[PDB]
């Protein structure tokens, strides 16, 4: 369309807010993951949404998400297994 409308008032704030929801993060609640911060609660599996503790999870390369060590997929390639 074609119209002359430009003049909104909004803001975001510092880059210290969870990614899942987008709320304020604490110093003992924020999860430094690849630069991005997440809530201890939000941060969970993508198949079982289970609290992914710092040491019991992995971020699959393929897609690029975070899954548990029980659901985490693995690149598919010729098995050529005997
Ligand atoms: Zn969150
Ligand atoms: Zn899982």
Swiss-Prot record:
Q: In which tissues is it expressed?
A: Expressed in the thymus, lung, spleen, kidney, testis and hematopoietic cells.
Q: Where in the cell is it found?
A: Cytoplasm; Cytoplasm, Cytoskeleton; Endosome membrane; Midbody
Q: Where is the signal peptide?
A: none
Q: Which domain of life is it from?
A: Eukaryota
Amino acids binding Zn(2+) 1: 18, 21, 39, 42
Q: Show where the LIM zinc-binding domain sits.
A: 16-76
Give binding positions for Zn(2+) 2: 45, 48, 68, 71
The entry sums up its family as follows:
Belongs to the Mical family.
Relate the assembly described in the record.
Answer: Interacts with STK38 and STK38L. Interacts with RAB1B, RAB8A, RAB10, RAB13, RAB15 and RAB35 (in their GTP-bound forms); binding to RAB1B is of low affinity compared to other Rab proteins; at least in case of RAB8A and RAB10 can bind 2 molecules of the Rab proteins simultaneously; ternary complex formation of RAB8A, RAB13 and MICAL1 is possible. Associates with the SH3 domain of NEDD9. Interacts with VIM and PLXNA3. Interacts with GRAF1/ARHGAP26, GRAF2/ARHGAP10, RAB8A, RAB8B and RAB10; may bind simultaneously to GRAFs and Rabs and connects GRAFs to Rabs. Does not interact with RAB1 and RAB11A.
Q: What is stated about domains?
A: The bivalent Mical/EHBP Rab binding (bMERB) domain, mediates binding to predominantly Rab8, Rab10, Rab13 and Rab15 (in their GTP-bound forms). The C-terminal coiled coil part contains the plexin-interacting region.
- State what this protein does: Monooxygenase that promotes depolymerization of F-actin by mediating oxidation of specific methionine residues on actin to form methionine-sulfoxide, resulting in actin filament disassembly and preventing repolymerization. In the absence of actin, it also functions as a NADPH oxidase producing H(2)O(2). Acts as a cytoskeletal regulator that connects NEDD9 to intermediate filaments. Also acts as a negative regulator of apoptosis via its interaction with STK38 and STK38L; acts by antagonizing STK38 and STK38L activation by MST1/STK4.
- The protein here is known as [F-actin]-monooxygenase MICAL1
Natural source organism: Homo sapiens (Human)
Ranked from the top, the taxonomy reads: Eukaryota, Metazoa, Chordata, Craniata, Vertebrata
